[PDB]
Symmetry: D2
Subunit: 115 residues, 4 copies
């Protein structure tokens, strides 16, 4: 709801389906604590990661497990994963979409923050 992830495949021109995504939140001791996770759907989307109540201001890391995705397709990839690290703020749009476009040796990511 307040945090959605969408993953696209630039080789096949398709959603990136069944990609593991792990979200972490930075703790007071500066370590990454697990926050939410899932696998992208047939549409390349992962919804329901968190709720407005739980998604408080803080520093979050979204890890997209790109290496396993490419290995499953038989394509040798460069990255171990794609990592998106950002601060969530309450004076900004209410909904965060993290979009990632994947190629074997490249990835691009953007944030769409609305409301």
């Amino acid at each position: 709801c307040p945090l959605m992830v969408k993953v696209l495949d630039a080789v096949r021109g398709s959603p990136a389906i069944n990609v593991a995504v792990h979200v972490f939140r930075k703790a007071a001791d500066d370590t990454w604590e697990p926050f939410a996770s899932g696998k992208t759907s047939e549409s390349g989307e992962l919804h329901g990661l968190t709720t407005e109540e739980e998604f408080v201001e803080g520093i979050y890391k979204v890890e997209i497990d790109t290496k396993s995705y490419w290995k499953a397709l038989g394509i040798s990839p460069f990255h171990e994963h794609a990592e998106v690290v950002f601060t969530a703020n309450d004076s900004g749009p209410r909904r965060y979409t993290i979009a990632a476009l994947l190629s074997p040796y490249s990835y691009s990511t953007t944030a769409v923050v609305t409301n």
Copy 2:
């Protein structure tokens, strides 16, 4: 329905709203004939450009009027527009989404072809 366009703004982290989009189809004499057009919605999307009946195999050009978009925001851009040129084929997924991510001096585009 068979052809959708989605445009995102990498400076603001938002949909690119009210961007003019012109679609052309290559004619027998190799000229670009107007096919469909519109402006992106509040979600950065342009739906209803064509129908399955009209969207036959052929070469299509999607022109996204990025220069006017940036000028309206007071940002000096590099490109006159972004152009996406592709062949539509019936042996491929039925729905075409042309996605574009815009910055003043760069743009990225991908095709998501499903069904």
Copy 3:
């Protein structure tokens, strides 16, 4: 020298070698007139397209023949080509590098403008 093109392959993580590039300039009658052409080298670069003297103010189109590139690698890509359209030298002479990163269903392009 004043206009250089660099092309990278996001599947292999390599320069995109032997990519054909055609440059056009918009004429007074609003047609695209041939201006220069060449092919990328082993480093993915194309130098020597023009000179400061010939590269006058105007609207230029750099067409990168991505479809032929992918087909030769056994990939049936989405786009016919990547086109980069821009006004050049309207504030006086500048040096332009057009960079493109290629995937079968996506491309990204940026400009580096100096002087």
Copy 4:
């Protein structure tokens, strides 16, 4: 030499100058150990991080301090940094160029691997 970083600014169409870059290598205990650091030059490039001798096989993280870059330009960006994580030299020595293209709410990264 074996590891170079190039950073471009998609808003200004320029090299991204004075960007801090920190490189880490995963140690036997699974922690990220400092490996090398530096700042991009006037050309957006960072050379001399390491040598063929010191750049042994391993998992490396290249952290590009994009937030500090944008803040100094008066832009409040989305990401804390851009992180590029990859296994290096597991098939023998190679030369790695990590390229990043930066916008306030987006970044793209690619790798060029030679030898």
